[PDB]
């Protein structure tokens, strides 16, 4: 393969194209490379903010017998995002804790448990 032989086969250049390659890339190497956008460091992942009687209804749709500690934080490979309040929103980690933060601001009592740190 010429990519191994290091040929620049770009189509604007000579008209050729590298033969083993995908013809569509929805995000190219630069915007895959930026992990700040993808991972959640220092970034809000839930963009709507609910009023009190909204938060209470959202908490009311959680099935009893549920702990926060049963929802492990996803790895770096997994994109950080929150679909808002959807059905089964408590299965989403970032949604769970973002909601927890609104419940801390609004002075809503938090029915679920809190995150446990297991130690040796």
């Amino acid at each position: 393969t010429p990519m191994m032989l290091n040929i620049q086969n770009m189509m604007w250049w000579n008209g050729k194209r590298n033969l083993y390659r995908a013809t569509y890339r929805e995000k190219t190497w630069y915007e895959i490379s930026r992990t700040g956008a993808f991972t959640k460091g220092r970034r809000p992942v839930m963009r709507q903010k609910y009023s009190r009687e909204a938060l209470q209804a959202a908490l009311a749709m959680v099935p009893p017998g549920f702990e926060v500690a049963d929802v492990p934080r996803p790895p770096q490979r997994i994109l950080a995002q929150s679909e808002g309040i959807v059905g089964r929103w408590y299965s989403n980690y970032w949604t769970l804790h973002s909601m927890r933060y609104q419940c801390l601001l609004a002075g809503v009592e938090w029915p679920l448990g809190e995150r446990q740190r297991p130690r040796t």
Partner: peptide
């Protein structure tokens, strides 16, 4: 490609083929 050309200084547009088609 014993030596890589400087391709970073060109904006991307296809040059016309020198044996130009009639």
């Amino acid at each position: 490609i014993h030596k890589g050309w400087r391709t970073w200084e060109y904006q991307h547009t296809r040059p016309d083929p020198r044996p130009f088609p009639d």
